[PDB]
Design an enzyme around this catalytic site. Structure first.
Site, short mmCIF file in Angstrom:
data_model
loop_
_atom_site.label_atom_id
_atom_site.label_comp_id
_atom_site.label_asym_id
_atom_site.label_seq_id
_atom_site.Cartn_x
_atom_site.Cartn_y
_atom_site.Cartn_z
N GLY A 18 48.07 -13.56 31.65
CA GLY A 18 49.03 -12.48 31.44
C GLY A 18 49.08 -12.14 29.97
O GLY A 18 48.37 -12.76 29.18
N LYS A 38 45.89 -17.55 22.95
CA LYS A 38 46.54 -16.27 22.69
C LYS A 38 45.80 -15.61 21.54
O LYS A 38 45.70 -16.18 20.45
CB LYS A 38 48.01 -16.50 22.36
CG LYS A 38 48.86 -15.24 22.22
CD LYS A 38 50.34 -15.58 22.14
CE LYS A 38 51.22 -14.36 22.36
NZ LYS A 38 52.64 -14.75 22.57
N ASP A 131 64.22 -12.77 21.25
CA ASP A 131 63.72 -12.11 22.49
C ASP A 131 63.82 -13.01 23.76
O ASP A 131 62.83 -13.18 24.51
CB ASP A 131 62.28 -11.62 22.23
CG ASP A 131 61.76 -10.60 23.28
OD1 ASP A 131 62.58 -9.84 23.85
OD2 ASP A 131 60.50 -10.54 23.49
C1 LIG Z 1 52.28 -16.17 37.81
N1 LIG Z 1 52.38 -16.24 36.34
C2 LIG Z 1 52.53 -15.09 35.58
O1 LIG Z 1 52.77 -14.02 36.11
C3 LIG Z 1 52.28 -15.18 34.09
N2 LIG Z 1 52.26 -16.59 33.63
C4 LIG Z 1 53.29 -16.81 32.62
C5 LIG Z 1 53.07 -16.19 31.27
C6 LIG Z 1 51.93 -15.51 30.90
C7 LIG Z 1 51.83 -14.97 29.63
C8 LIG Z 1 52.87 -15.13 28.73
C9 LIG Z 1 54.01 -15.81 29.10
C10 LIG Z 1 54.11 -16.34 30.38
O2 LIG Z 1 55.19 -17.03 30.84
C11 LIG Z 1 56.44 -17.07 30.20
F1 LIG Z 1 56.23 -17.40 28.90
F2 LIG Z 1 57.00 -15.86 30.30
C12 LIG Z 1 51.45 -17.61 34.09
O3 LIG Z 1 50.77 -17.39 35.06
C13 LIG Z 1 51.40 -18.95 33.47
C14 LIG Z 1 51.18 -20.14 34.13
N3 LIG Z 1 51.20 -21.11 33.21
C15 LIG Z 1 51.41 -20.53 32.03
C16 LIG Z 1 51.47 -21.28 30.77
O4 LIG Z 1 51.38 -22.49 30.80
N4 LIG Z 1 51.59 -20.63 29.56
C17 LIG Z 1 51.70 -21.32 28.27
C18 LIG Z 1 52.29 -20.27 27.34
C19 LIG Z 1 51.63 -19.00 27.82
C20 LIG Z 1 51.62 -19.18 29.34
N5 LIG Z 1 51.54 -19.20 32.16
#
Ligand SMILES: CNC(=O)CN(Cc1ccccc1OC(F)F)C(=O)c1c[nH]c(C(=O)N2CCCC2)n1
Length: 293
Positions: A18, A38, A131
């Site tokens: 995402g 990122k 935020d």
């Molecule tokens: C079904 N999931 C989604 O629609 C999106 N995400 C969460 C996600 C993605 C990008 C940025 C932030 C995110 O989650 C939260 F921070 F809002 C994920 O899929 C996800 C799953 N694990 C993680 C994770 O461990 N992250 C570490 C920090 C960035 C995302 N993100």
């Protein structure tokens, strides 16, 4: 705070998961550990990159996503990854939605308050998240553990304290405001100010003029007071995050079951002035009267 210099050439990038408040985020491998990377999109986010990096270097807390390091070539952040998804998706996102309980709700908000209390206590200056909203709160470990993300700041109108978009001087109390909007959102399973919609400025207008999410039918008065004091116009009338964490912590004794994974399916109908809660408070009332008898 000790971040590792990381060599991008030992990172095995996988699928995009995402895109945060800024940037794009991808799942990846590195030293055989699953991670999230990122990257700056267009270098218009090279301010927001050096920001997130400088503050995330300082922070180490269970309820905040742990930064493992960064890369110079290209310039990218490397974070822990785990199975789960945004609080936003869990509440409102892709069907089928998971069922959750009052306990889940209150635990999510306690854990957020814990992570933010940590930030506000930073020395020599407090870190203000500014935020806080369900799209920047990650649920992991079967939907039971919440981790704060997206410090790029240092879409959000619905969560944002009036003084911040009034251009005014604001403090760490802007977060307390957001926290309360979120408490309301997990209880109700509704999007704050969704009925208003329009573009951002219609919500800003509304909040600036004192509009707040509607009161919640049958909500325990202690929760009602916490929530509505979080929403006060005057930021000095809002409680500190430490007060919140103490109050939420004490409240949990009437909300057992936070540690149950989200495993049950739900199909929920979505009906004004006093909304119904999505979670149920009957058990809380029962447990409360038991202790107070
Ligand atoms: C079904 N999931 C989604 O629609 C999106 N995400 C969460 C996600 C993605 C990008 C940025 C932030 C995110 O989650 C939260 F921070 F809002 C994920 O899929 C996800 C799953 N694990 C993680 C994770 O461990 N992250 C570490 C920090 C960035 C995302 N993100």
């Amino acid at each position: 705070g000790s971040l590792h210099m990381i060599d991008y050439k030992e990172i095995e990038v996988e699928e995009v998961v995402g895109r945060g408040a800024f940037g794009v985020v991808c799942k990846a491998k590195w030293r055989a550990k699953d991670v999230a990377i990122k990257q700056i999109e267009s270098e218009s986010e090279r301010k927001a990159f050096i920001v997130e990096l400088r503050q995330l270097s300082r922070v180490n807390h269970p309820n905040i996503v742990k930064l493992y390091g960064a890369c110079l070539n290209p310039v990218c952040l490397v974070m822990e990854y785990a199975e789960g998804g945004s609080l936003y998706n869990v509440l409102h996102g892709a069907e089928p939605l998971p069922y959750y309980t009052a306990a889940h709700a209150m635990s999510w908000c306690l854990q957020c308050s814990q992570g933010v209390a940590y930030l506000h206590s930073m020395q020599p200056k407090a870190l203000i998240h500014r935020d806080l909203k369900p799209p920047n709160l990650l649920l992991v470990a079967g939907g039971t553990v919440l981790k704060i993300c997206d410090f790029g700041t240092a879409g959000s109108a619905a969560w944002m304290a009036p003084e911040v978009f009034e251009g005014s001087n604001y403090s760490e109390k802007c977060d307390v405001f957001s926290w309360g909007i979120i408490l309301w959102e997990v209880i109700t399973r509704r999007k704050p100010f969704d009925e208003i919609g329009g573009p951002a400025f219609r919500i800003m207008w509304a909040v600036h003029n004192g509009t707040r999410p509607p009161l919640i039918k049958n909500l325990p008065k202690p929760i009602e007071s916490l929530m509505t004091r979080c929403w006060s116009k005057d930021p000095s009338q809002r409680p500190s995050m430490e007060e919140i964490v103490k109050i939420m912590t004490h409240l949990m004794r009437y909300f057992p079951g936070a540690d149950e994974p989200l495993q049950y399916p739900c199909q929920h109908s979505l009906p004004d002035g006093r909304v119904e809660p999505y979670v149920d408070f009957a058990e809380f009332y029962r447990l409360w009267s038991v202790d107070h008898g």
